[PDB]
RNA sequence: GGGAGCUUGACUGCGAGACGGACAUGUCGAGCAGGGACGAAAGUCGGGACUAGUGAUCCGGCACCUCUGAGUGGAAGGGG
RNA sequence: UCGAUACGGUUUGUGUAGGAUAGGUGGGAGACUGUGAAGCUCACACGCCAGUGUGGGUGGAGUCGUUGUUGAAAUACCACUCUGAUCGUAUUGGGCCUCUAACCUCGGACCGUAUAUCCGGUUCAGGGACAGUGCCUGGUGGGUAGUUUAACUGGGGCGG
RNA sequence: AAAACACAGGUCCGUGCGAAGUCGCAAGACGAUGUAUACGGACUGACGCCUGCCCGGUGCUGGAAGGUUAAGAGGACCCG
RNA sequence: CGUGUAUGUGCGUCCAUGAUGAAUCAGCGGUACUAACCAUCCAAAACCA
RNA sequence: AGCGAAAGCGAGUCUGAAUAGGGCGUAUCCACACAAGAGUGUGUGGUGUAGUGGUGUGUUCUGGACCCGAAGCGGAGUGAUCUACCCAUGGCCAGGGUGAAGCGCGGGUAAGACCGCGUGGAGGCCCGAACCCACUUAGGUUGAAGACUGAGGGGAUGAGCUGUGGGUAGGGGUGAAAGGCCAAUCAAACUCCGUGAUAGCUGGUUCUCCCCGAAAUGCAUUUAGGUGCAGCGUCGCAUG
RNA sequence: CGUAGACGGUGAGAGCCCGGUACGUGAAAACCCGACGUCUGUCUUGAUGGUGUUCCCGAGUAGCAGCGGGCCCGUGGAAUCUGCUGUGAAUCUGCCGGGACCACCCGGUAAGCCUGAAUACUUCCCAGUGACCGAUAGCGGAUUAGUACCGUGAGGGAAU
RNA sequence: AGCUGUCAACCGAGCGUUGAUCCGAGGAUGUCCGAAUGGGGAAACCCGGCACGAGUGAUGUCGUGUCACCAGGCGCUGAAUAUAUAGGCGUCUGGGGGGAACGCGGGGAAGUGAAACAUCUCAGUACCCGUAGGAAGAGAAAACAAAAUGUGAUUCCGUGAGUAGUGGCGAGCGAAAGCGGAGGAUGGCUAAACCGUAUGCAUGUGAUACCGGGUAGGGGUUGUGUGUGCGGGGUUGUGG
């Protein structure tokens, strides 16, 4: 199995190194944990992007979580979408968690991971202000207001 | 335990052959392994019966 | 039957004509050629005075041969 | 923790003519020294205790070459290598101890679930690359199955 | 219809727990909602007095210093 | 066991009679952030033989 | 067109060193030479070669193969309304005896052990109907009955008997064990199917006349009551 | 009489007595086969050279190995095809077949899919035929026949 | 122009030239059981929910619809638990069972033969399982062939041939090429390279980008990796 590392693992190599491991090692450990990606046409670029993104998005302590909360709740954001005629308000699909994260960043906010965004619970199907809860930590939830606007 | 849930791989039937050439019916079972497979990155696992061939080919995934 | 000299016919290619007889087996054979032994020569020698000491076919082994060789040259395998 | 090979290096060669424990071979008339030699006092390895390589201190200006020998020369220096002793870089197998992440738990809790000692999921607590299960392989195997176990004969059996 | 079986009582062997055993291709079930004072198998057969000698043979239990031994590894050398 | 109508007694949602109990301000002691008080144990650095 | 294992050669070919001798082949006959009386052969000439496709009959091959008959062997189903054992839930056991433990009282003792007398009502306890068995005997034996009847016999509060409902299925069940029992059938049930199973064995195989007419021996045989070949019959052709 | 002398029936062998027969004729509706339209697609720039260590040409696949299956082929010198279990390639100088295998030639272009006709059969419906049966025959069943009856059941199963 | 099916008449009543009986086609009605499907059940008999209507003084009662399970679309919700998912609601569309033979794909005997028997045979037969269709399967060369200037998808029939061979070389088993016919479609469509577009997942705020030159302007992130879908392009062996 041929892998490109996205983190430093001891006795294997450094982030970005191409390594050949036993199938059991990669399939049951490195790949589940996201320490490596399968070697592929774009894998060198993807592995560097993954590691740099992780270091920016990671949250460490409940103190950092409360700092993120108090920063994030001080904002109101704009999400841009492609939508039906105004009377329906129906969007031509659905806001993704990646849209919410990139909108929060584009509006001068933290770089959060997308799995923290409780988007399904927001039930955003039309256009207008919609509150979305972001779970920074088990005890730290921030509420953010998104405008959804036709592009 | 002789049928793969992904590709449908079943057992083959044939003969065991004695030194004296006595032919007795036997099966060739697929090597299917219990795997706790996932469906999306970082999701709930579901126990399935996958053949070793599907595991080797990456048709089942883990977390 | 007893003794002595030399020797390898305890041969290769063959075999007119017979014995025996359910069949398969078995048995005798003069004589022709090759290349030899002994003998001065005539000649005798295809094991042992004679009749037991043995086992069909299949399958397979080994040596040799101017046979065959699955498109062709080889080879494997198969023939003699 | 062993074991095969490879690659970086080092140890180590008693025909006799002999300055003498003659490596076969090529570049071979000059090296080795003050980034400190001849000559000794010790530590270490082998041992045919003949004597070799080596570290430190001391010493301070050599041993040297066709030198004649010798099939074969210089322990003046440089190259791959071989009788064999070894160390680290790889490659690759055997055993052993661990780790967690595959896999396992008829161990706990919680959820699907109003109902539920089924089942599945989540999680905690334990096993753990073992076990279980494919494929391949050697054993044990009247537990079971298909069958065989002659004829002659003053009936058959026994004897022959 | 018994002198046979069963029997209470005895001894041995197995079983540390979805045990051993059994039914089933498995899942699962019985064993048992039991836990070695229990459960299964074997022989003996209330009770009384007793139950000697042999471990060469064949089983069972444990051991592994030797002899032998599969597939898997290896792959010299040889042949087309 | 059910169903409908009628009649008569008390019981009541709103009216109201009886019934309880909790937040919070303010006056007080022992938990006790924290600098200390008291009792006790040990020797880094260590002096001497 | 044959010969040869074949390459291949061809009225020849194979074996072989042979122009040796044999093997197989050149339809069959006739004449004439030339060699042989070792069985006659070798050359010339002539004469010429008979097959194949329908269809009758006899035998034979593969099929049920002239017809009838096993015990048994598979595949798939059906059965625990009989019987064996088990599970759940009900019922039944006249009458009469015996007198365990425990308890109480009185002897006895320092207290006991122990010993009388009551009370008590134990037990795969006793006698004996129902009920459940089937020990002996007589009868029945083309029965009244495919297992019974009469007379006696055993158990009869228990490892009891019994109703209802249920469960275990064939190499399987169940069995206080007789290979017992599993629907009058059990050393492997029943039914349908493979299937017209297979029998070197037994039985059977139907109108007529005319001619001929055996064998019961030899050899071999997982053979001895089977079969092959020979011997002996018959029909046809040839030779007389 | 006959384009009718098929076959039945009718009081006994009927072309001319009857139902018919030869030959003609006929469908409101439904169904089936066409044709023709609508309607639906699709196309409308093609021929022609050059050029190249450029890219592509069906991957857990081919190949290989173990154990099997199946092929005339019973493991055999055993190709070709194929299941399971391991191992695991090349994109045209590629790869796979030409009965082990190798070389050289020849054929073909695997691991994507669809495809009418020639072939097999008849529960059922229509029209016919027989050197087929004629009531112990022919279907088990010309008669209430899978009935009566037998068996717990599967199933067996008449007679007139 | 006669009828009221028949065994099957007898009685008792009626229809039909205003066209009956009868024959053909299309509709209506079609209790209960049965896949059986509201729930249950010893098939054909027991008990219901909901909606609408009828009937009661009201209860009871009576019509007519509808209510199983599973699979797959579409919508809502998203447990333990955060992302979510399992699941839960709602709704639409299907499937289920039967049928004599014929097809395809799987599983797969034994009697028997070998005069015993195990290899082998019987036989891939009997039976069984999964699925069809009016036929099915197969089919458009990773084919044969043998140096012929060969044939050219598949299937089926006749030959080749009881041959080559195979076989306890026993009993037995047994091709293919080639050639003669039936049929006509030597038939079609796709995957990749490379363009375009949509959109998932990473990035980026600067180059890039906006069909391509030569440019002249402009616009400013429209960008840049990689995956997937839908259109162009590409359907081939002399290689394309
Ligand atoms: Mg692996
Ligand atoms: Mg098979
Ligand atoms: Mg067999
Ligand atoms: Mg003499
Ligand atoms: Mg000799
Ligand atoms: Mg002779
Ligand atoms: Mg003799
Ligand atoms: Mg001579
Ligand atoms: Mg002689
Ligand atoms: Mg002599
Ligand atoms: Mg033999
Ligand atoms: Mg050849
Ligand atoms: Mg060849
Ligand atoms: Mg040879
Ligand atoms: Mg030979
Ligand atoms: Mg293991
Ligand atoms: Mg036996
Ligand atoms: Mg048999
Ligand atoms: Mg005898
Ligand atoms: Mg005798
Ligand atoms: Mg004897
Ligand atoms: Mg008796
Ligand atoms: Mg006991
Ligand atoms: Mg167990
Ligand atoms: Mg014992
Ligand atoms: Mg006893
Ligand atoms: Mg032992
Ligand atoms: Mg038998
Ligand atoms: Mg039977
Ligand atoms: Mg039953
Ligand atoms: Mg008693
Ligand atoms: Mg009895
Ligand atoms: Mg009598
Ligand atoms: Mg009596
Ligand atoms: Mg009495
Ligand atoms: Mg008595
Ligand atoms: Mg009594
Ligand atoms: Mg009692
Ligand atoms: Mg019952
Ligand atoms: Mg007995
Ligand atoms: Mg009986
Ligand atoms: Mg039997
Ligand atoms: Mg048969
Ligand atoms: Mg018979
Ligand atoms: Mg006579
Ligand atoms: Mg005879
Ligand atoms: Mg007539
Ligand atoms: Mg291709
Ligand atoms: Mg085979
Ligand atoms: Mg090949
Ligand atoms: Mg097809
Ligand atoms: Mg008659
Ligand atoms: Mg009849
Ligand atoms: Mg019966
Ligand atoms: Mg009946
Ligand atoms: Mg129902
Ligand atoms: Mg039901
Ligand atoms: Mg959630
Ligand atoms: Mg169906
Ligand atoms: Mg036999
Ligand atoms: Mg026989
Ligand atoms: Mg088709
Ligand atoms: Mg042959
Ligand atoms: Mg495309
Ligand atoms: Mg070509
Ligand atoms: Zn699989």
Curated annotation (Swiss-Prot), chain A:
PROSITE patterns: RIBOSOMAL_L9 (PS00651)
Molecular function (Gene Ontology), one example: structural constituent of ribosome
Entries under Gene3D superfamilies matching the protein: Ribosomal protein L9, C-terminal domain, Ribosomal protein L9, N-terminal domain
Keyword Cell inner membrane assigned: no
GO cellular component: ribonucleoprotein complex; ribosome
GO biological process: translation
Keywords on record: Ribonucleoprotein, Ribosomal protein, RNA-binding, rRNA-binding
Origin: domain of life: Bacteria
Family: Belongs to the bacterial ribosomal protein bL9 family.
Further remarks about this protein from its record: Binds 2-aminothiazole antibiotics, which are antitubercular agents.
Physiological role: Binds to the 23S rRNA.
HAMAP family attached to this UniProt entry: Ribosomal_bL9 (MF_00503)
Protein name: Large ribosomal subunit protein bL9
Organism name: Mycolicibacterium smegmatis (strain ATCC 700084 / mc(2)155)
């Amino acid at each position: 199995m041929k892998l490109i590392l996205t983190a430093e693992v001891e006795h294997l190599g450094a982030a970005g190194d191409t390594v050949e491991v036993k199938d059991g090692y990669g399939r049951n450990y490195l790949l589940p944990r996201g320490l490596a990606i399968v070697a592929s046409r774009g894998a060198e670029r993807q592995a560097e992007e993954i590691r740099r993104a992780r270091e920016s998005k990671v949250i460490r302590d409940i103190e950092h979580a409360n700092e993120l909360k108090t920063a994030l709740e001080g904002l109101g954001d704009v999400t841009l979408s492609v939508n039906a005629a105004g009377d329906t308000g129906k969007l031509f699909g659905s806001v993704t968690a990646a849209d919410v994260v990139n909108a929060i960043k584009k509006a001068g906010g933290p770089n959060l991971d997308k799995r923290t965004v409780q988007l399904a619970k927001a039930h955003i199907k039309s256009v207008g202000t919609h509150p979305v809860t972001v779970k920074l930590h088990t005890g730290v939830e921030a509420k953010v207001s998104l405008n959804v606007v036709a592009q | 335990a002789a049928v793969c849930d992904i590709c449908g791989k079943g057992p083959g039937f044939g003969k065991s052959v004695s030194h004296s050439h006595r032919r007795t019916s036997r099966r060739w079972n697929p090597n299917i392994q219990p795997v706790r497979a996932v469906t999306r990155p970082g999701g709930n696992k579901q126990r399935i019966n996958a053949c070793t061939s599907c595991i080797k080919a990456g048709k089942v995934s883990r977390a």
